[PDB]
């Protein structure tokens, strides 16, 4: 305990009071004097017609030209976005994939899902074809997100209510992150890769630290399970999409919400969220078959990326911000610009 | 195109490989195995030969069955049950000896799921002999207070089947009910005929004639 429960309740009340004391003015009351970006008419420049099953993940290369797409067909095809060509087609051991990653160096591609294993594949093998460099088996739940810190390091979000930092050289969990009440369904590494935020299914987004291994802040502002997350390019904010048909802009330093990108005509939950280079546009995917483009400072729909026959599961903006790639369940990876 | 002609050629050949893999993977009948913990799932999957997911693929009458034992996933279903669409059927196993509310609730939640509106669920009521012995030992009203009727084995089985079929609300799907005594290997022929019926129905629906 009773004393411990009372202490937890009073600590939560103090945290909420401190967070609400710093909200002198909302985002919409200070940026209301700028011109909106208007109708952002983006046309499908490329369409990756190579997958035959639902696309559940897609990641952009550091060169903004190669993109890896993972589908339930058991394949992880690396795409040439400039010429639509495919440079690799890796047959996965387990076809039940829910996440994929591309190393910033470009040598490695991750993969994970219901197999409880985050596999690492060596693209630049001297023997030609891609070989599985490691199979990280330490999770008791389904892997939901994986990001490369470097060629050797990797952080994984799993469905056993925890996140684990791995070591691809040895295969053992260097660091484990515990504290999520529900399933951790999203993860996004910061630009400096010194920290990351995991958006779990308990309507909370916990800010972790890779070096320290302990959580710093929790963001309990949503009303349903968080299905997507993405850092603001400045690295001091992030937008988390949930099943409540709203994606909110959380601030790390303010430690609270900034704007709720919700519309009265939207009931479908977010499945993918991604920012532009400047962060003004938040291309947040929806289960309503459209990847709406949200003005991050106006909280208004700048444009709609209609053209997907099924729910979009992964939206990815290039590192040079030239194009945005949306991977929906209709086995299509469309490139918009 | 200076040497991008070889790059295109590689893209085309691996696209042909992807197409061949897709053709070779569409022949496999995907069946999702669900049910309450310790409900004969291990026994029924062992009777058909061969940590999170345990795929048990096998071939029966020139038809490749892929049976997925996803009961080991210690997480909520709704965040990963959406990847199990396009499956032929959901195989449901219930131990009639041990009583039941969890099994019925999970059946109601899985049959009314938006993704599984069209995917008909195969229902298995195993431990029939053990259930009859328990009926001869204990009444069936322990877990069914509202069940009024004869206390025989046949009536109890009929009541359980009715209570399980009273959970779906979509006419496009049918629940196939089978009873097993945990000592017969003929539980796969029922699976085969149910799968063939579902394939016929899905093909008719896809042609617009159903």
């Amino acid at each position, epitope marked *: 305990l009773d004393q411990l429960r009372q202490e937890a309740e009073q600590l939560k009340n103090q945290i909420r009071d401190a967070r609400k004391a710093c909200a002198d003015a909302t985002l919409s009351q200070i940026t209301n004097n700028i011109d909106p970006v208007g109708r952002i008419q983006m046309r499908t420049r490329r369409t990756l017609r190579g997958h035959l099953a639902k696309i559940y993940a897609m990641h952009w290369g550091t060169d903004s*030209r*190669l993109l890896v797409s993972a589908s339930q067909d058991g394949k992880l095809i690396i795409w*040439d976005s400039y010429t639509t*060509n495919k*440079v*690799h087609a890796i047959p996965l051991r387990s076809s039940w994939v829910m996440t994929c990653a591309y190393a910033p160096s*470009g040598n490695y591609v991750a993969c994970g899902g219901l197999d409880n294993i985050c596999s690492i594949y060596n693209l*630049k093998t*001297r*023997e*030609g*074809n891609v070989r599985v460099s490691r199979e990280l088996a330490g999770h008791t739940g389904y892997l939901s997100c994986c990001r490369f810190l470097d060629d050797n390091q990797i952080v994984t979000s799993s469905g056993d209510t925890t996140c684990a930092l791995w070591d691809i050289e040895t295969g053992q969990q260097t660091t484990t992150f515990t504290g999520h009440t529900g399933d951790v369904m999203s993860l996004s590494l910061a630009p400096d890769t010194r920290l990351f935020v995991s958006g779990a299914c308990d309507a909370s987004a916990k800010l972790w630290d890779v070096r320290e291994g302990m959580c710093r802040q929790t963001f309990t502002g949503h009303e349903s399970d968080i299905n997507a997350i993405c850092f603001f390019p400045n690295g001091n904010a992030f937008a988390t999409g949930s099943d409540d048909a709203t994606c909110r802009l959380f601030d790390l330093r303010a430690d609270q919400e900034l704007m709720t990108y919700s519309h009265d005509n939207i009931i479908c939950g977010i499945t993918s969220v991604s920012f532009s280079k400047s962060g003004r546009l938040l291309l947040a995917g929806y289960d309503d078959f459209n990847c709406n483009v949200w003005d991050a400072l106006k909280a208004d729909r700048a444009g709609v990326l209609a053209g997907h026959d099924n729910r979009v599961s992964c939206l990815g903006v290039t590192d040079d911000g030239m194009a945005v790639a949306t991977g929906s369940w209709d086995s299509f990876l469309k490139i918009w610009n | 195109s*200076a*040497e*991008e*002609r*070889a*790059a295109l*050629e*590689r893209s085309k*050949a691996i696209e042909k490989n992807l197409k061949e893999d897709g053709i070779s993977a569409a022949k496999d009948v995907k069946l999702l195995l669900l049910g309450a913990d310790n409900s004969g799932k291990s026994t029924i999957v062992k009777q058909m030969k061969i940590t999170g997911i345990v795929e048990t693929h096998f071939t029966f009458k020139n038809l490749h069955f892929r049976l997925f034992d996803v009961g080991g996933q210690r997480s909520e279903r709704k965040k990963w049950i959406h990847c199990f669409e396009d499956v032929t059927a959901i195989i449901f196993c219930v131990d009639l000896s041990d009583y039941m509310h969890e099994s019925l609730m999970l059946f109601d939640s899985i049959c009314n799921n938006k993704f599984f509106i069209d995917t008909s669920i195969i229902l298995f009521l195993n431990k029939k002999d053990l259930f009859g012995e328990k009926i001869k030992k204990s009444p069936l009203t322990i877990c069914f207070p509202e069940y009024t009727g004869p206390n025989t084995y046949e009536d109890a089985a009929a009541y359980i089947q009715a209570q399980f079929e009273s959970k779906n609300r979509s006419p496009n799907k049918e629940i196939y009910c089978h009873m097993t005594c945990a000592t017969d290997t003929n539980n796969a022929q029922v699976i085969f005929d149910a799968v063939t019926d579902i394939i016929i129905a899905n093909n008719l629906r896809g042609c617009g004639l159903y």
Partner: single-chain antibody, 234 residues
Framework: DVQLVESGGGLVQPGGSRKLSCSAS????????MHWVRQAPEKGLEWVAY????????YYADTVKGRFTISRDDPKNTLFLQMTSLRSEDTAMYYC??????????????WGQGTTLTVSGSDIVMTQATSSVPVTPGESVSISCRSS???????????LYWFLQRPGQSPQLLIY???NLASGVPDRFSGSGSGTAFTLTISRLEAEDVGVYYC?????????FGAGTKLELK
């Protein structure tokens, strides 16, 4: 390890035929485009034939087309080069070269040991003015190469390949596409160029780096090599 071994060499009477087999192991042969590069006993390298993965496109040299035959055996993981009507100009060592083609790939990366065979207009012309650069170890040696047609394609890829053939050894790729260092090559090698004027600047030359260097173009077949810049001690 990755290894290419050729066989089927020896003295051949003029006007006959012979089959040269390139056995391969340690790598995925089925997904590689195997080349056949010939080197005269006293002259530089010269491209002969090329075959891609799946035996889709087969190209040939100006003086080789119509007589030779390049084929693969993917299940046997061996490369073949059938040649008929051996003229006196075919007396040379035949090298086996692997090359995989995709975005960011490194063609011509691994060379075979080589087999010795003895018989008793619009193509890009690559000219190397410096045929001998005697430089002591510890100094920087730069080899220049020129092309009749600009090698810079529309997509920004300039196709100039630099090789190093140590005496008694097989050529080793150093820089591919005139800017990208090969796999395992020491970082001291630097590649540069613009359109036609290409230079392979080497820093801190060592005793093990003594050899002859070549420049190869891949903009359009046939792939023509240079005269060969030979580096000697002191």
């Amino acid at each position: 390890d990755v290894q290419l071994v050729e066989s089927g060499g020896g003295l051949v009477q003029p006007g006959g035929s012979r089959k040269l087999s390139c056995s391969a192991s340690g790598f995925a042969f089925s997904s590689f485009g195997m080349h056949w590069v010939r080197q005269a006993p006293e002259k530089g390298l010269e491209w002969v034939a090329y075959i891609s993965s799946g035996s889709g496109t087969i190209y040939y040299a100006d003086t080789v087309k119509g007589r030779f035959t390049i084929s693969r055996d993917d299940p046997k993981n061996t490369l073949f080069l059938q040649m008929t009507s051996l003229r006196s100009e075919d007396t040379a060592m035949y090298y086996c070269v692997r090359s995989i083609y995709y975005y960011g790939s490194s063609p011509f990366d691994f060379w075979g040991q080589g087999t010795t065979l003895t018989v008793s207009g619009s193509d890009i012309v690559m000219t190397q003015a410096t045929s001998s650069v005697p430089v002591t170890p510890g100094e920087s040696v730069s080899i220049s190469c020129r092309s009749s047609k600009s090698l810079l394609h529309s997509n920004g890829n300039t196709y100039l390949y630099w090789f190093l053939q140590r005496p008694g050894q097989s050529p080793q790729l150093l820089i591919y596409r005139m800017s990208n260092l090969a796999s395992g090559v020491p970082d001291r090698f630097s590649g540069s160029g613009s359109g036609t004027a290409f230079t392979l600047t080497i820093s801190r030359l060592e005793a093990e780096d003594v050899g002859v260097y070549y420049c190869m173009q891949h903009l359009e077949y046939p792939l023509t090599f240079g005269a060969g810049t030979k580096l000697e001690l002191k």
